[PDB]
Structures are given as C-alpha cells and as structure tokens.
Design a binder for this molecule. Structure first.
Ligand SMILES: Cc1cc2nc3c(=O)[nH]c(=O)nc-3n(C[C@H](O)[C@H](O)[C@H](O)COP(=O)(O)OP(=O)(O)OC[C@H]3O[C@@H](n4cnc5c(N)ncnc54)[C@H](O)[C@@H]3O)c2cc1C
Length: 362
C-alpha cells in the first residue's frame, strides 16, 4: 500500500516503485495510450500566438531549432467541420476572435526540440519563482516544488527518450539517448539529484493519479458525454475512459487526513486560490516560450496539473454529485478535460520510459 502525506509542511509519498512501475507500465499504459489517440483527445485547443508579457526577444533565432520547435498546425478538412459541432454542442451547456485554434497532438509528439541554454533556463527560473504562498508574504510550498520539479523531469525525460539521434542530410532517426538520460538523471553523475528529480516525477504522477480517482463521479453521470461526431466510440470511448478511471481507483493509494486539501475553510480556500492564481501566471509565462512545441506542451501539461489540483480541492463539492442531474456545482471544459488525461498521459509515459532506460542500462 502507498501513502502520501501533503500537509504542506513536509510533503512526500512513501510507496514502492515496482508497485507503480508494474501498475502503470502494464495495467494502465496501452489503454490510456489507446484513449489518447481517441478522436476526442488528440485535438487540443490553444492560442500559440499570445506575445510575451514580461519582456521581448526573438533576438538570436539555432536555425534548425526553430525548425524543430515549430507546431505542425495541419488539420484535415473533415476534422475542420468536426470542431464546430463541438463548439456548438459544447455551447448549449455550463459555459461561464479567440486566435485559439485546435491542434492535433498525434501530429505533435513531445520530444527533443533543441530548446536550450539561457532562454530555457530563464523560463524555468521564472516558473519555480512562482512558488509563493500565504501560510502577507511568500512561503514556498514543498508540494509546488515537487510538482513542478516532477514536470520538468517528465519533460527532460521525454527529450531524453525521444532524442534526434541522427540527421543525415537525408534521414532522421529519433530514439533513446542514454548519454543524455544518464547525464541528466544518473545518481552518481548528478550527485543523487537525478534520483531525487525522479522521485519528484512520481510524486506528481501520484498526485494526478489521485486527482483522477477522485474525479470518477463526474464521468459516472450518464448525462455526461464525450461529444464528437459519431456516437459509437463516443460511448466506446466513454466506457474506455471509465474503465481507466476505474483502474486508477483500484490502485492502493492513501493520503494523510492532514492534507491541506481538507476544507478548513479559509485555509483550504486561500490556498486553492493561491494555486489557480499561480498556474495562470504560469500559463502566461508559456507565452514567453519560443519553442512552439515546448510552449504547446507547457500550456497543456500545466493546465492539466491545475485541473488536477482543482479536483483535489473539490473533494466535497464532488461528493454531492447530481448522480442523475447535470453538474452545476462543479465543471470541466473540453479544454481542461483533454489537458487532464493528456497531462497525466505524459507523466504516465515518462514513468514507462524510465523502465526502458533501466532495461537498456543493464
Ligand atoms: C515549458 C518548457 C517546455 C520544454 N520542452 C522541451 C522539449 O519538449 N524538448 C527539449 O529538448 N527541451 C524542452 N525544454 C527545454 C528543457 O526543459 C531543458 O531546459 C533543456 O533541454 C536544457 O537542459 P538543461 O539541463 O541545461 O536545463 P535544465 O534541466 O532545465 O536545468 C535548469 C536548472 O534546474 C535544474 N533542474 C533540471 N531539471 C530539474 C528538475 N526536474 N527538478 C529540479 N531542478 C531541475 C538543473 O540542474 C539546472 O540547475 C522545455 C522547457 C520549458 C521551460
């Protein structure tokens, strides 16, 4: 049995890795991955064109890095129709020119982009700088650190496992680059920092995994619908998602009643609000990122994380779920939902990746 303590003071999870490795890598993976190619999930809405609101740049750019960081914006004629049906259908419900257009994630896997050096380092510094809570002055929450660190790790993991290994003037080979993984993660080479960083990825992973288990209800109500064009998979996909959320629930994970997601009024609230606040800044930050694929996955993976927390805060709010009625109390836009499973999906992939790495490193 796993066990997570998120009091805010010292936050951590005592939990066997083989347990998660085994669970995630074999129980969950092929099916989630299946779901993430589902029509409903390959297409994410995003405004990639907002300008940086904290400084200027584009100075210097390297030429191939803009070539790697460029989002393939492509979209089939049919899909083009298909999104309106969504906008439309989606309009007629809970709904509190957006140069946000839908992007195809399968056309845009997260891998090595050549994004590096000062421009990246700055963004990271600024993201971590956002760790700042009322316990009115800043306190750092360890949770935030570990969350963000886990995310950063998942990424450096993806770029590691999905590196552009060879670029003949003809052919391009993408794959696992051990030396990178190792330079960035090996315990010795990093004086134990990498392992920590990996322990942090897992933290994140579990958080999102809990966030999923605690959100199962919202999908259980048969007025909820993964609306796309057809109805068959819309239901096939519906049960899919569900048996996944069911699997997540199966996983023996427990939290200390101490967790600052407990509704101690103002504390829980202030905190929740401190959070949603911080992630908005973060999203804003992504608007200062020139690796457009990086920027995309940034937005995505963070919205997802915010959403996860949103759930993790709405313990109660969800516990009184209109089992037949439509959920006014709590809600999730398509945008958020896509981001939720997707964010979880890259962390889920990252975890998988670590195993490949173990296996190659033998
Ligand atoms: C939002 C975003 C998305 C990105 N997407 C991609 C991508 O898809 N492909 C790609 O190649 N690059 C991507 N990058 C750049 C990438 O994350 C690295 O910064 C880059 O590859 C350079 O590596 P580095 O070791 O010099 O920098 P980093 O690894 O980012 O180092 C920055 C500093 O923080 C420390 N650090 C590094 N990782 C962690 C961690 N997990 N927890 C705590 N501290 C850490 C480092 O040791 C160093 O002190 C992205 C960056 C951002 C900000």
């Amino acid at each position: 049995r796993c066990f997570c303590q998120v009091s805010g003071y010292l936050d951590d999870c005592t939990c066997d890795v083989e347990t998660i490795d085994r669970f995630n890598n074999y129980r969950l993976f092929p099916r989630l991955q299946k779901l993430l190619e589902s029509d409903y999930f390959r297409y994410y809405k995003v405004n990639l064109k907002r300008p940086c609101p904290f400084w200027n740049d584009i100075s210097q750019c390297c030429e191939q890095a803009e070539r790697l960081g460029a989002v393939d914006e492509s979209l089939s004629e049919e899909t083009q129709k298909a999104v309106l049906q969504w906008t439309k259908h989606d309009d007629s419900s809970d709904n509190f020119s957006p140069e946000a257009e839908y992007v195809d994630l399968l056309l845009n896997p997260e891998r090595y982009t050549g994004y590096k050096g000062p421009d990246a380092w700055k963004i990271w510094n600024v993201i971590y700088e956002e760790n700042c809570f009322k316990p009115g002055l800043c306190v750092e929450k360890r949770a935030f650190y570990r969350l963000i660190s886990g995310l950063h790790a998942s990424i450096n993991v993806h770029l590691s496992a999905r590196y552009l290994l060879q670029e003949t003037w003809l052919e391009k080979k993408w794959g696992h680059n051990i030396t990178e993984f190792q330079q960035r993660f090996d315990g010795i080479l990093t004086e134990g920092e990498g392992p920590r960083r990996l322990k942090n990825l897992y933290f994140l992973y579990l958080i999102e995994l809990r966030a999923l288990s605690k959100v199962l209800p919202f999908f259980e109500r048969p007025d909820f619908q993964l609306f796309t064009g057809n109805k068959i998979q819309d239901e096939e996909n519906k049960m899919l998602l569900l048996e996944i959320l069911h699997e997540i629930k199966s996983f023996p994970l427990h939290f200390d009643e101490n967790s600052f997601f407990a509704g101690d009024k103002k504390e829980a609230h202030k905190l929740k609000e401190d959070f949603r606040l911080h992630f908005r800044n973060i999203s804003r930050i992504m608007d200062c990122v020139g690796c457009f694929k990086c920027r995309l996955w940034g937005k995505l993976q963070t919205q997802g994380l915010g959403t996860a927390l949103k759930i993790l805060f709405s313990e109660k709010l969800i516990a009184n779920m209109p089992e037949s009625g439509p959920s006014y109390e709590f809600h999730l836009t398509r945008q958020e939902i896509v981001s939720l499973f997707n964010a979880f999906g890259r962390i889920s992939t990252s975890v998988k990746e670590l195993e490949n790495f173990r296996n190659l490193l033998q």
